[PDB]
């Protein structure tokens, strides 16, 4: 999740947040993070919880 | 210039910081606050100097 946040930082930094994208992740502490400005990008994304 | 900074904050915020866009800016002194996170997305733009 730490390195997930790192990926999200880098993919903003490369600008790889496009509405084309829909992506696949593993660890499930995903909701808890500092997350807010990302959802304003048109990208499709989905998570998992139990 | 301040409104330019607001513009680019909004444009990265929507994800209109795309490599597809090739743009033109009238003023000159945009460099004071950083453009380096805005640099490495692959975008296209130009300005002027005198």
Swiss-Prot record, chains A, B:
Location in or out of the cell: Cell membrane; Postsynaptic cell membrane
Expression by tissue: Expressed in the olfactory bulb (at protein level). Expressed in the deep cortical layers, dentate gyrus, reticular thalamic nucleus, mammillary bodies, pons, and cerebellum of the adult.
Superkingdom classification of source: Eukaryota
Modified how: Mass spectrometry data suggest the protein is N-glycosylated at five distinct sites.
Sites where a glycan is attached: 44
Family: Belongs to the glutamate-gated ion channel (TC 1.A.10.1) family. GRIK3 subfamily.
Note: The postsynaptic actions of Glu are mediated by a variety of receptors that are named according to their selective agonists. This receptor binds domoate > kainate >> L-glutamate = quisqualate >> AMPA = NMDA.
Subunit structure: Homotetramer, and heterotetramer with GRIK4 or GRIK5. Can form functional heteromeric receptors with GRIK2. Interacts with PRKCABP. Interacts with NETO2.
Functional note: Ionotropic glutamate receptor that functions as a cation-permeable ligand-gated ion channel, gated by L-glutamate and the glutamatergic agonist kainic acid. Binding of the excitatory neurotransmitter L-glutamate induces a conformation change, leading to the opening of the cation channel, and thereby converts the chemical signal to an electrical impulse. The receptor then desensitizes rapidly and enters a transient inactive state, characterized by the presence of bound agonist.
Protein name per its UniProtKB record: Glutamate receptor ionotropic, kainate 3
Gene expressing this chain: Grik3
